């Protein structure tokens, strides 16, 4: 499956989805599909806006995050410190999206972190994880596309509410 074909899944979702707002659950599932990754889309404060997970659902810690609708405040803080795309992060790096208490299971895991920016502001983080294979530049194109477009969507959303708080 060519890179062109992969980028088209995201473009198709953006072009043809209903409503003015793209659903980040849909976006997470599309990225998950074309990069074969566990996917988190999180807010500035680590609220889970969308996810699409496979192996990670076998972790009760992960499951609890999903119930709480937040990643851990510590991981959130560490994601906010990542200022540009950081890729192929290993299981011993605190930036891993995999639970370090399952080190043997995820020994070859790779994590890539995409800061989400819009309107010149940090609006969230896109996090992708694989149990095995390294990310390559094509994966990065897809990730940064996705991150850019999520950023446009959050930016529009927040300016809808900020100008509705400006009414007051």
Cα separation, 25 vs 41, whole angstroms:
8
Binding residues among 35-64 for ligand GTP as defined by CB under 6 A: 43-45, 47, 49-50
CB 72, CB 94: distance < 8 Å = no
The entry of its own copies, ligand GTP, ligand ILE, none that residue 72 binds, CB within 5 to 8 Å by partner kind: ligand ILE
Q: Is 35 annotated as a binding residue?
A: no
Q: How far is CA 89 from the centre of its chain?
A: 15
DSSP code string of 43-108: ETT-BEEEEE-SGGGG-HHHHHHHHHTB--HHHHHHHHT--S-EEEE-TTSTT-SS-GGGTTTTTT
Q: Is 158 annotated as a binding residue?
A: yes
The entry of its own copies, ligand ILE, ligand GTP, none that residue 118 binds, CB within 5 to 8 Å by partner kind: its own copies
Binding residues among 89-148 for its own copies as defined by CB under 8 A: 117-120, 137-138, 140-141, 144-145, 147-148
The residue assigned the tokens 């806006």 is: 49
Write the binding mask 13 to 42 for its own copies: x where contact by CB under 8 A, - elsewhere. Answer: -xxxxxxx----------------------
* Residues near ligand GTP (CB under 6 A): 21-24, 43-45, 47, 49-50, 153-154, 157-158
């Amino acid at each position: 499956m060519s890179l062109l074909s992969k980028t088209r899944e995201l473009n198709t979702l953006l072009q043809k989805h209903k409503g003015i707002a793209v659903d980040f659950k849909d976006v997470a599932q599309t990225i998950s599909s074309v990069t074969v990754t566990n996917v988190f889309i999180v807010s500035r404060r680590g609220k889970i806006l969308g996810s699409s997970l496979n192996e990670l659902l076998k972790s009760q810690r992960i499951i609890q995050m999903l119930e709480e609708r937040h990643i851990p405040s510590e991981y959130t803080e560490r994601l906010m410190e990542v200022k540009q795309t950081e890729s192929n992060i290993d299981i011993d790096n605190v930036l891993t999206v995999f639970p370090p208490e399952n080190r043997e299971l995820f020994i070859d895991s790779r994590t890539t972190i995409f800061p989400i920016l819009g309107g010149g502001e940090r609006l969230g983080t896109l996090v992708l994880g694989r149990v095995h294979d390294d990310f390559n530049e094509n994966d990065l194109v897809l990730g940064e596309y996705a991150a850019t477009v999520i950023g446009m969507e959050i930016l529009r959303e927040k300016h809808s509410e900020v100008e509705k708080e400006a009414r007051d």
